[PDB]
Design a protein around this ligand. Structure first.
Ligand SMILES: *[C@@H]1O[C@H](CO)[C@@H](O)[C@H](O)[C@H]1NC(C)=O
Ligand SMILES: O=c1[nH]cc(F)c(=O)[nH]1
Length: 246
């Protein structure tokens, strides 16, 4: 299981935690040198548990589906919380079984629903390590509205970071000062599926995308991705959603 402690955390250890997180996700083949996530995994092995310690030392353990990196729920002391969706439902059958009581949140785990519950788009939610420390603290003491925003932070400083090196770096820059994500970061988070798909469909198409993926670069400019030589593919994306799950 992968751990990360916010006390004494700096860009280096966060990077190491994020590396650990990538290493914990199983894969058989690589596509254009990028680990390909399994189509499916049966049993409790389908879930990865992240122990997260906030600055004061308090911890929550988060359950992640290793086939897509989606957070399914988490455990705070003796209570367990899972999103209101089938996947998480299934997941609750394998993790945090010993929790003295289980709560299901009033929303599913997709950004659309979390932004509603939180009452604000993630474009306006500062992220960073300090922000992660808050999020961890927030989830310990239940408040579905607060948790929604906390989860939007956790998902991005965790899952999205593992998936994209750019995002990992965005977080390292925000190690001592939170800042809303650049729209490039949002652009990526929303293109993971499309990119995972087009990168796989390129395997038999000479590394050329059947359909190009439109993103926004760091300068804020609209940009098209047509082939695996792009830096997005050669340098950025670190994991790929298996096309079986698309
Ligand atoms: C592929 O993408 C590269 C990098 O963005 C770009 O310079 C080039 O025009 C593209 N080439 C082809 C054949 O699509
Ligand atoms: O829409 C989503 N994207 C990525 C995630 F990890 C998630 O839970 N929801």
């Amino acid at each position: 299981d992968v751990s990360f402690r916010l006390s004494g955390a700096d860009p280096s250890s966060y990077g190491m935690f994020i590396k650990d997180l990538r290493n914990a996700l199983p894969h058989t083949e690589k596509v254009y040198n990028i680990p390909l996530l399994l189509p499916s995994v049966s049993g409790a092995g389908r879930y990865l548990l992240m122990h997260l310690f906030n600055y004061d030392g308090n911890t929550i353990t988060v359950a992640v589906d290793v086939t897509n990196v989606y957070i399914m729920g988490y455990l705070a002391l003796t209570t367990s919380y899972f999103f209101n969706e089938p996947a998480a439902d299934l997941a609750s059958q394998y993790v945090f079984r010993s929790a003295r009581r289980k709560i299901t949140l009033p929303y599913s785990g997709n950004y659309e629903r979390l932004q509603i519950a939180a009452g604000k788009p993630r474009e306006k939610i500062p992220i960073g390590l300090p922000a992660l420390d808050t999020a961890i603290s927030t989830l310990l003491h239940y408040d579905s509205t607060a948790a929604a925003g906390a989860l939007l932070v956790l998902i991005q400083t965790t899952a999205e970071a593992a998936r994209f090196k750019y995002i990992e770096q965005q977080i390292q820059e925000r190690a001592y000062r939170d800042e809303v994500p650049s729209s490039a970061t949002i652009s990526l988070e929303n293109s993971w599926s499309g990119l995972s798909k087009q990168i796989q469909l390129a395997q038999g198409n000479n590394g050329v995308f059947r359909t190009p993926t439109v993103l926004v670069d760091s300068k804020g400019n609209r940009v098209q991705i047509t082939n695996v030589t792009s830096n997005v593919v050669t340098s950025n994306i670190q994991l790929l959603l298996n096309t079986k799950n698309i």
